[PDB]
Design a protein around this ligand. Sequence first.
Ligand code: ZN
Lengths: 104, 97
Amino acid sequence: HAAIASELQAIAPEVAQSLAEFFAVLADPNRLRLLSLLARSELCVGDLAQAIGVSESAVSHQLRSLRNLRLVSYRKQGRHVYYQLQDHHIVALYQNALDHLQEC
Amino acid sequence: LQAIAPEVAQSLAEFFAVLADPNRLRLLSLLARSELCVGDLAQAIGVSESAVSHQLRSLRNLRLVSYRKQGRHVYYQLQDHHIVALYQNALDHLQEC
Ligand SMILES: [Zn+2]
């Protein structure tokens, strides 16, 4: 019987359901490759396409759902559109997940 | 630059896939605040000790949780601090969005 076992309670089923869906969104090798690039630098669709070795149309399409899913965001500067990870939570959960499997 | 190797991306994808389980997340949400014995978790979750023990076996094999011996009790805890951090960050991100 842990010291504070009586003081704890699990996350609500609705919250756990929403969190599970979030992780389901990340269980995609293609999405993770794109996020691995944005974790190190903000990049334009042109740079991402060259790195992953796919067309700009393909990256642009994948980035759309990523944007809708609130995993990435973008900023416009002059004639360029730079994509970035949504927030620091995204890079942290990404880096921690990777470090975890590296540490096993 | 270069993206992560394809097998690394695949392993990471499978890792997030195992986390896409509401029941596992409820268990992890408890361990995120304290290591706990099977009895404490079973009562918190409202399920039998046998059930939680079974759920924990899977989590152990998946390297999400570990256990240790402290006196006359076995306590389960999250495998490492990375699990702690990714859980909290994912949760906070969802709470603000
Ligand atoms: Zn966030």
